[model samples]
Target: APAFSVSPASGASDGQSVSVSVAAAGETYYIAQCAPVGGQDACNPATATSFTTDASGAASFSFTVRKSYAGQTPSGTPVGSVDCATDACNLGAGNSGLNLGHVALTFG
Candidate 1:
């Protein structure tokens, strides 16, 4: 399996649509959004958004990345799933475990 990376590492502007790219094709990728960094509420699904990849074997979906979450901190993280997307070359489906590929942003 190859490692995936998201371009525009800054993610999206608060409440604005952001595009996520797929860097690997051996599993699934998800924008694991959250708040209150390193806290219990950090993995809350109330703020998670799912994006789809383009037809070119790369994710080209758009979602809004928050600026400030509860407690004025960002706890969101991208949890890339493994063997989740059957397509493995397009949109990811809900049929695999989370891989938590990598984190590309942090709130200060």
Candidate 2:
């Protein structure tokens, strides 16, 4: 299992960069997101999410809240999952076990 953290912790706004840190190394990971400001049906198809860890066994990514974000308050649902040999390597339904971090994003 892996874990994740975000910098600044709050005050995220649309078009700004958010730093995502994953606490694992030398493996592939994926960050799946629900709709930024709408229904859950707007999520990615699973196969499209993935990121690689650095030699330090950690990884980082930058995400910018969509300009169209319209949530009434600061809100987001980002989850990460690791790739296992038996797993599909994607955040699809079949690989739910790998699911880890569940970070939120807020648009300021």
Candidate 3:
């Protein structure tokens, strides 16, 4: 299974930068983004980032949080737009297989 963690873990305002680290079951390419808990994509595509893990199966990246897109979807996602002002959003990271993980986040 995959595992992930976010630095400072919570209490970040929108547009603030945060770090994300992931450890997967194998060397894999992964995508990371934020969305409502148990909800669909709600992140800004411009803020989304992806990376591939090396032999150590470790990947890390930093991205800015968002809660609005002015009617745009995350990577053209069909889900609702993210608005942490009203919903609980979380950062999710995963690969093509069963490896997946999420960390809850809070907004000011």
Candidate 4:
């Protein structure tokens, strides 16, 4: 897995912005979101942000975590949300483990 991290790792709240940084994965594009590892994307597409890493394999972006983003779908329903109040929602980045990054969000 490439290097990844979420800043203010344990002090952000739902609907707040969390900065995500990815390194060692240069020029690679990725989607940093707050969703389950096994489920589909739970964050609303309109609110989600996708970015390409810089020449140094380093990239960072601001992302908002929703307690429960709903009213959408991929099939019958698009699954991409994580209950930040209960589940350990992560703000992650990268190309491959872009399905990666295991940093948990600790909200207040």
- Using TM-score as the measure, the top candidate is 3
Q: What TM-score would you give candidate 1 relative to the actual structure?
A: 0.46
Q: Per-residue lDDT of 1-108 in model 3, one digit per residue for the tens?
A: 567787865677767788777775555544545555344555555665567777776577787776544323445645655567666566666656754767776666
Of 1 and 2, which scores higher on lDDT? 2
Give Cα-based local distance difference scores for all models.
Answer: 0.39, 0.43, 0.62, 0.58
Q: By descending lDDT, how would the candidates be arranged?
A: 3, 4, 2, 1
Can you give the TM-score per candidate against the true fold? 0.46, 0.52, 0.73, 0.66
> Model 3 segments beyond 4 Å from truth?
36-40, 70-81
Best by lDDT: 3
Q: For model 1, which pairs clash? A: 53-59
| Winner of 1 and 3 under lDDT | 3
Worst-scoring 10-residue span by lDDT in model 1: 82-91
lDDT of 4 by residue, 1-84 (tens): 477776676766557776677777665554534555354544455554567767776676776666655523323465544566
* Candidate 1 C-alpha lDDT tens digits along 34-95: 33232332432433555444444455555454554332222344333222112111112221
Clashes of each: 1, 3, 0, 12
